Symmetry: D2
Subunit: 116 residues, 4 copies
Amino acid sequence: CPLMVKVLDAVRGSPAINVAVHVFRKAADDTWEPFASGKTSESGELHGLTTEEEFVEGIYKVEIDTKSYWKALGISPFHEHAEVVFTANDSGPRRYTIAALLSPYSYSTMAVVTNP
Amino acid sequence: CPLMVKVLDAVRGSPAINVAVHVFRKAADDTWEPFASGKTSESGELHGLTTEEEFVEGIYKVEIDTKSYWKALGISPFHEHAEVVFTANDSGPRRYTIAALLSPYSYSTMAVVTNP
Amino acid sequence: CPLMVKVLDAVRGSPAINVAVHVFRKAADDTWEPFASGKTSESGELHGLTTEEEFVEGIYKVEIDTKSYWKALGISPFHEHAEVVFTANDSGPRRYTIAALLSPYSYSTMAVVTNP
Amino acid sequence: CPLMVKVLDAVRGSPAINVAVHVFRKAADDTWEPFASGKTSESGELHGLTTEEEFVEGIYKVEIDTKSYWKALGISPFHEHAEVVFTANDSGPRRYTIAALLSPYSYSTMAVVTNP
């Protein structure tokens, strides 16, 4: 559990279920290499993306596919996706929870970072 | 205009128009006394609530009638209203903008305090 | 667990620990009667406030004592407290998670409502 | 002015001044091509990015240099930058305001889309 993503739906007051999430890591040649992906569960949470060993220092991008979520609810949202870009593990291994609260024309995102 | 209120609708990506706003000031006996009120304009803003002379240091509450706003859109909301409670402090010249971003099950509020 | 409160600190990227929370329920004479209170744990969470039996239909106010939290960190925040006011259980018993994300001049609050 | 960006600082309750903002438009080959850029004004706003003629339908990215903003205040931030990605749609006349509310470990963004 060094990386967990949680997504909530501010319209329904619920977890955002079946939201696709793609994680990327910046490579040596400055491109975004695919790192891990998954979908949020019935709790709005996505666990198991990576391991402590694999989640090395680097610049990571978490891309939450909000448009597809809204569209399947009948809403035409503003954003294509929510993107969260951050340096990880640069002072040693940490645990990151990336949370997103979604509305059709707005989101917020928060990171909780803990040292195990 | 030392106090302005702005209300935005995160479902429709618009100003929140015709929202009732009530301002109170905490009295000596610790009750909330009516101070100012109005309805947001087409821009989601409510100007002209008070004056520099009248807006003395004290504890204020801004109550925003969110429930009625959502009910008029046919959307079931969580909150009865949104409440913003703060102390006004003389600390050189100051203007307060209270912003609220509304979703059915969530709101965020921000205060922007500036000196012209 | 019909009522849980979670508080996060957007400055530190952490749970907001030792935050006082007071819950009130609107009485028959339209006053706010004390209902329950507590403090957030090391996880930022406050569990055990009430029981399914005691948490009847009504209008509830959750008052999160944000000012005192900030002040003990050396920050002079804007708000006195964050207040969350809502009708509960009016279509039968539900479980409510009230979350707050705190910054010195801003907060957001979200409710997750589930039917057990 | 079909596109305006506003950036606010939730730690200090102020406009976020002198923040670099870069706008990109998605090209045919799926890369992000520079489109407009500037730095926020004393009001936290960036006006004059584009024109109605130039701002055709397409996918845009607004990148806000949050990290440099926080570093200048001596505050350690989580994100590399804040990114807002959206489709511009002709649907009668329209003006887009992209707002971002910044905290060290969190941001929220809102789009206000209006027709004069």
